[PDB]
């Protein structure tokens, strides 16, 4: 007969709180107004400081941040040039941490992983201009994301990069958004930037977190790095009786971005990375750093997503795997990056039992690691929606 | 009934309570099930030995379709002359696709070029292609999912890959046409005819409709190796109620079929009507104007149209305005000679044979000129009372 | 049923006979209490190098019986030495297409200009709007040049053409079957007219002069100077009013009288080429034009023509010279070379099953790109034109 | 109904009590009556003067068919060049056969070559031929029942002999199709058109389809004489019961008809579908692939088939396996270009016009290429509600 999973039994005992959460989200999105506003601008030399702290404005229901990073890389070598890596200007930011007003961190990931989830949630390369056949001069007019492909010996290059640091899931789904109408509780957006060490790899180094690589990289340096943060929030919140109208489940659930690093790979043996409990995984990104070398599928036998340790659900070679990615973002990721979409059916071990991610390599070099990147929800329920001054 | 024989209110000759239970049972299935894709067969062969293969898919779950990866290697053993790609290219690696339901019931019987274009038209873009952007981050053509060299020189070798989605269900959210295969009657069949050394290399001046390469060195071009891999997409972990499986009973008893046809007898500056058939629910129409081995970009056509009996021409347009309606569909143009007609918002369903027709008015017609028609359509299990498409 | 599928008594039990007796009473009241008006509804003069397709707004009044279309042209031959000569279809190719839409956006007649001209001939009993030559000493004859065209335009000369077309809606002046009640305030009623232009009206030597007007060695330099058109609408005004609104023949106004053309190819020598008639139409006549690859012959490339039926195979299997003898009893002449007329006005083809009646051409010699250009007139009785199919099949 | 539109149990929408009374009355007639064959008409003419004849036999009994002996004499008045026989040969001595009922209802309207091949197909051997054996007893070709010289030299004269069975009843034990001529109405007609001096001699290069001889002296060949004789097979002493004649009522109101057709519009390497009309009961199909006046032994055909709407191809075979299935039928091969399809065990009977089709996939198509289709079929007296036999 019919038997429900523990995930479906929880969905029937929380079905009146979810109906109240849906009708409170519809009232907020109907009656509020989207505002984007600059909250911080700074220009620094990264030979003195590279870790920065950004205090957001405490207003409305925050949906996310737009970070604009601009750089002025100068090459001081006499006779040798450098060239862009495969991640390029996405390594201008090395780490993004955001802390809640409750001092609970939401997103703690690197710069390349934030860019690829921005790519995956758009359906195209993030803030890119596609090439067409039109005689009307569209195209790369404004240089939103730009970097020169080669900085010569004695030249100077200007870089621009945009990051969307997400808090809410989308502009119509407020799962993960932050109430910020609290004056005494600050937020925090920690931003690590590149240096003259971590951004100019030599010939034979690991260009994973670098920006330029070449035989003149020992004399490449920044001149300045400027950043600008834009806070995107919902102003003019609806107020009924009993205070603000709030999607309580959507504000207590987080939406996170985390990356890891697994090692110890063996040729032609299944490397398994287990999905953890309590998380509802929306996308996995695996990067095969094969010891400072990135190859277009020719060092992988197959990628997979297993149930318990048995009965695979998508076991594909690295071109059939990339064919499912081309239905998502209308291109494929750089060399070594493999994306797995789980947005319609999220990987939830309460629903499916133990689920792992499998990589079977073909060639494993020395210092070869597997760089995971996750994107998920997590709930952790609440009992007080209060915090109102009664002497007002 | 101002234009079509039955409008959408008169086309409600169905039960409308079996339609309500079908839509409810489909939405239950698409929640409690999980999509699995897995390889079912793989074989590497030589086209000089064998060229037609029959593939046995697994009898699991509710089957949604098949992803066929075909990889090939071509040696050009000419002394001095090279060959070049045709307009259809690696999409002619597979010559025929026939699928058979466990009750020995055929579903899709097309060529490979027609199956590729329906894959393009259902994505909104060329199938499994990578768009070219302006990013400094190195996206682009990285993995070479669909790829073929544009020219194989004399004494060189070219490696080329092609993917085909053989559909059974209509889409990922519409389960019309899907096959229940848990406890079947017999095995399923996936007949696959591949390209030969006789069909894949056309000489200078030949008809490059089914060819892959064409040039002066085509007499000394040969295959070395063709591998195929068939993946099966299906829905596992089906929901179970008080009476066994929860099933969309008239989505599984419906056939989402793709079919091919061909009509000849064109004369210049008059209408060449290609009459649709009754009792099919036509969803799209692809016409390929093979003008005697020559393919032109609308230069040999006065107009294209789609008529009715009561109404006149409904979308009579010149070839560049017909192409403008397809750049809103797939965001590019089809190759030369290929014309797409979408009827997905309003399917053709007549009850009289020649009630709706497809019209091409040519202006220059060479000998052995023909229209190569491809159809995708819905039909129930009473396809046995139908007639020929066209 | 021995020849036809439905006998005239069998297809009279498929109709309401009390609604038909009430329909012929309402037609006699309309035809004796109305006034026939003919009125010019549109006129403009153009250059076909600028515009050649026109939409004509008629007048929304009365019960419309048809349209009279006068076309005048001014062809110039800018060649240096060579002249051109008039083709067999001639000035009848001044109009290329005719489409009429009624007040309810329902099309009626969608045919070519040469096919409209031959049905105009076939219903008069003579070549349309022509004057016969007599031996009267009183100066009758061709005084006004109603339909006129010079036979040859020399190098550096100009010719004036004049052509008339009757676009029928009603079947005749005594039978209002096919007429349109147009006293409704709308704008969907129009008369689309595509005219000849500089590409379709001058054919080179050895080309296909089917839709051309002139043909010769100097046809590359022939141009139009000017084309004028004038449209006259014939209708019945002051409709009789009893109670319950107007007194109208309801079956006559819910029936279409249409003219349609189609082309079929695929002829091979010395075997039958059966062009099938269609289900649910009521065919009245049939024009067949044998374009033998740009060549038109006076029956010297046909074995025989015939009409065909499922049981009772051939009904008029005749020689081409004997087929022409049955049309000299109709129009007191014969049609141009390649044109063959089949009359079915006494017993109309109405056949309830698609290819039951067919039209046969047995050719002796078939050139490359040969075809039959059919032309049909029919009653089709709206509420079953929606359930109809294609007008022909081979 | 997996394969056909209506299977044999669904095609039993007849009375089945009038079927058992028809079967009972048929064997009473076949036991009690007596087969009579007698001469109707003999006539000797010149084809330069007259060539079409109308034979009016007497209205006796239950008519089973007609035997037509045609004898001819052909002079070759050329100076130095000779002519040679075609593949169809003396079977083109009769160009057209039409029979009419006493009620002026036509039954068979074919050519002479198609009437000959149906005579071959219903026997199991070439019609009225001598099997070559090894016996020392002098059997063989003694009487020359069907004879023609293979080559008529310059100045020579050749004598031809040819026999035709024009069928009315289907067989000698099945009276389906027979004509009850004991009626108070007019006499039956048998229209016969013969060869001329314009249609029996083809020049070198011309189409030898309706010709008898073909060669470089064919401009000077002419008939000296053609004689014909018509015999009539019928049953007399019909049984009388209590209510008059004992008659197979729904066997005499059924027509066994042979009919001819022709379709054009072939292009290389695509399917050319020729659809089987509804309401006929097709027993056989003869398709002659005239490839522009050239007849080949399967070298210009990829495959032949018989499609269905619900099913796929049912007998898709290469042209030598298709000929292998007819060697189990007539114990030899039909001439070059002639392809035979047998449906006598399960006749085609659709109720929808394009349910079953006949497919030829060519590989080389010349100009004026066509298929010459010949059908034989059963139909009731409601042939008046039928359509064309494409």
From TrEMBL, chains B, D:
An example Gene Ontology CC term for this record: viral capsid
Keyword Nucleus: no
This protein's name: Major capsid protein
All copies of domain P3 C-terminal, residue ranges: 253-390
UniProt KW keywords: Capsid protein, Virion
Cellular compartment(s): Virion
Gene3D superfamilies: 2.60.120.20, Viral coat protein p3
InterPro entries per UniProt: P3_C, P3_N, Phage_PRD1_P3_N, Viral_coat, VP_dsDNA_II
Presence of keyword Transmembrane: no
Domain P3 N-terminal positions: 1-238
Pfam families named among the record's database cross-references: P3_C (PF25514), Phage_Capsid_P3_N (PF09018)
């Amino acid at each position: 007969v019919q038997q429900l999973t523990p995930a479906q039994q929880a969905a029937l005992r929380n079905q009146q709180a979810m109906a109240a959460n849906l009708q409170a989200r519809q009232i907020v999105l109907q009656q509020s107004y989207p505002v984007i506003q600059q909250v911080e601008t700074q220009t620094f030399d990264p030979a003195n400081r590279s870790v920065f702290d950004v205090t957001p404005a405490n207003v409305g229901i925050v949906k996310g941040f737009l970070v604009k990073v601009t750089a002025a890389i100068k090459n001081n070598h006499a006779t040798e040039a450098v060239a862009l890596t495969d991640f390029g200007p996405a390594n201008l930011v090395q780490r993004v941490i955001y802390y809640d007003p409750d001092n609970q961190r939401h997103t703690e990931t690197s710069g390349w992983h934030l860019h690829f989830v921005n790519t995956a949630k758009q359906g195209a390369p993030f803030l890119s201009s596609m090439v067409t056949d039109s005689p009307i001069k569209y195209g790369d007019v404004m240089n939103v994301i730009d970097a020169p492909a080669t900085i010569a010996a004695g030249a100077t290059g200007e870089l621009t990069m945009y990051y969307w640091v997400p808090l809410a899931y989308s502009e119509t789904d407020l799962t993960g958004a932050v109430l910020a109408n609290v004056p005494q509780s600050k937020q925090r957006l920690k931003l690590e930037f590149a240096n003259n060490n971590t951004a100019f790899a030599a010939v034979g180094a690991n260009p994973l977190e670098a920006i330029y690589q070449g035989a003149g990289a020992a004399d490449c340096e920044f001149e300045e790095i400027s950043y600008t943060v834009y806070q995107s929030y919902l102003d003019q919140l609806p107020v009924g009786q009993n205070g603000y109208i709030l999607p309580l489940i959507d504000l207590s659930t987080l939406y996170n971005l985390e990356n890891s690093a697994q090692a110890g790979l063996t040729p032609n043996v299944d490397f398994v990375v287990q999905y953890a409990n309590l998380y509802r995984y929306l996308s996995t990104i695996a990067v095969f750093d094969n010891g400072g070398s990135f190859n277009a599928g020719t060092d992988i036998n197959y990628l997979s997503q297993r149930t318990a340790n048995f009965s695979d659900t998508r076991k594909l070679d690295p071109k059939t795997w990339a064919a499912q990615t081309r239905r998502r973002i209308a291109t494929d990721f750089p060399k070594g990056v493999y994306y797995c979409d789980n947005r319609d059916k999220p990987i939830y071990t309460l629903q499916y039992g133990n689920v792992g991610f499998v990589v079977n390599p073909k060639t494993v070099n020395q210092n070869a690691r597997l760089l995971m990147g996750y994107e998920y929800f997590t709930s952790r329920t609440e009992l007080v929606n209060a915090g109102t001054i009664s002497t007002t």
